């Protein structure tokens, strides 16, 4: 099974900036007829993949000319001349030369812009959460870019890591800024026992972690 490897796993490029994805083969994928059968697919979020290029260079009927392919042997590359918002998605390789035919790892294309600071927030559990017998402490880290974000919970000075909920939102469109909603759940007996709940936020825009905490005792 020929292995196809794509680099980089992510490629942030601003609008109008040429993009270049690269593909590598565990073994040469040349074929006798004078062609090597490599195809490029694009899968926008919530949709099935769409064909862009086949046989290295040939463009499928109905794709903008800004797309172009090239390569040989075990090295192929896809170039997007002038990127546009509609070009966002994951680009995949595909070798149609040796049975079985294998896909590439994928290269998530994103658009880069001026870094934006995170907007951290913390909300204590609601009344219904107490009635149901639980604790829902939620930390909201909205509109932060880039993905250089980390979350750590230090309860009353002790760092808890078991049972951590990690959740990230894909890049937006109106602002093209990421977000995070990592939280933690606690039991009433395990909730009332401790006193201080804290949620730090470490980001490139601010090396010092951002502090957002509340105390159970009020």
């Amino acid at each position: 099974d020929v292995l196809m490897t794509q680099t980089p796993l992510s490629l942030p490029v601003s609008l109008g900036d040429q993009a270049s994805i690269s593909c590598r083969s565990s073994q040469s994928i040349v074929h006798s007829n004078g062609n090597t059968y490599l195809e490029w697919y694009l899968q926008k979020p919530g949709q099935s993949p769409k064909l862009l290029i086949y046989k290295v260079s040939n463009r499928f009927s109905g794709v903008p000319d800004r797309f172009s392919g090239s390569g040989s042997g075990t090295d192929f590359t896809l170039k997007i001349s002038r990127v546009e918002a509609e070009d966002l998605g994951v680009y995949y390789c595909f070798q149609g030369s040796h049975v079985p035919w294998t896909f590439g790892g994928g290269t998530k294309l994103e658009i880069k812009r001026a870094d934006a600071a995170p907007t951290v927030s913390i909300f204590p559990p609601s009344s219904e959460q107490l009635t149901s017998g639980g604790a829902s402490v939620v930390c909201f880290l909205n509109n932060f870019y880039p993905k250089d974000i980390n979350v750590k919970w230090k309860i009353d000075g002790s760092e808890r890591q078991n049972g951590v909920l990690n959740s990230w939102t894909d890049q937006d469109s109106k602002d093209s800024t990421y977000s995070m909603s990592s939280t933690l759940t606690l039991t009433k007996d395990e909730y009332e026992r401790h006193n201080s709940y804290t949620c730090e936020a470490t980001h490139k825009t601010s090396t010092s972690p951002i502090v957002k905490s509340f105390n159970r005792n009020e």
């Binding site: 099974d1 074929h31 007829n33 062609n35 059968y37 195809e39 697919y41 899968q43 099935s48 993949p49 769409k50 064909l51 086949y54 499928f60 994951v90 995949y92 595909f94 149609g96 049975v99 079985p100 035919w101 294998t102 896909f103 790892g105 994928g106 998530k108 907007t119 927030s121 913390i122 909300f123 204590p124 559990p125 609601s126 219904e128 959460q129 149901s132 829902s136 939620v138 909201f140 909205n142 909920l165 990690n166 959740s167 990230w168 939102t169 937006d172 109106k174 977000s179 995070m180 909603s181 939280t183 759940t185 509340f214 105390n215 009020e218």
Partner: protein, 218 residues
């Protein structure tokens, strides 16, 4: 040309499921049917292929034994059966039309979603969240409406009749223990929040549940 796939399926671990892909508008028997797996995380993995005209089939080594292909020529449908389902088999499965060394995968199915779990149809447990008592009030304040303890997906969290279309960040659902949980946050000025009324219109078509509960100020 159109490839139509079966609907979403939910199965228990150790069971087996049979997905179908129906092709119309072309010579069904003369094109290979490619089966592609896409885990929710990332990546496209080819399971194998079948030529309905003959019985020929190929499988990628990772799926050999897990998946079996069959085709029905009378009704232009191709079937893939997954055996001994587990958690890692939960993904979206695509079918594509392929002719090796010639026309590539230009047409795809809509994608069939398969989830493997022992849970039942639990309704939502929306817990509206209000700002904590020990928290400063700023010009811009973000609301919070938590939803958890629901299965199966999806749950369409929104505002009253699209009350606040913009400024909404619906974070992806995540499995805390065995059930799915999500969150949301909408930015609203503190001036209009006391006057303007908005409520998270949580929904659950699988359980035929439609419950909405707003957050009261602290």
């Amino acid at each position: 040309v159109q490839l139509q796939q079966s609907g979403a399926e939910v199965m228990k671990p150790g069971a087996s499921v049979k997905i179908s892909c129906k092709g119309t508008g072309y010579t069904f028997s003369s094109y290979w049917i490619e089966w592609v797996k896409q885990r929710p995380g990332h990546g496209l993995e080819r399971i194998g292929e079948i030529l309905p005209g003959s019985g020929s089939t190929n499988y990628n080594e990772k799926f050999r034994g897990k998946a079996t292909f069959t085709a029905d020529k009378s009704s232009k449908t191709a079937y893939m059966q997954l055996s001994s389902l587990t958690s890692e088999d939960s993904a979206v499965y695509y079918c594509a039309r392929y002719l090796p060394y010639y026309y590539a995968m230009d047409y795809w199915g809509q994608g069939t979603s398969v989830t493997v779990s022992s849970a039942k149809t639990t309704p939502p447990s929306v817990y509206p969240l209000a700002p904590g008592s020990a928290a400063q009030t700023n010009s811009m304040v973000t609301l919070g409406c938590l939803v958890k303890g629901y299965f199966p997906e999806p749950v369409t969290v929104t505002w009253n009749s699209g009350s606040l279309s913009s400024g909404v960040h619906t974070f992806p659902a995540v499995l805390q223990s065995d059930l799915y949980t999500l969150s949301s946050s909408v930015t609203v000025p503190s001036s209009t929040w006391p006057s303007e009324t908005v409520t998270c219109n949580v929904a659950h078509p699988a359980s035929s549940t439609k419950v909405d509960k707003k957050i009261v100020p602290r």
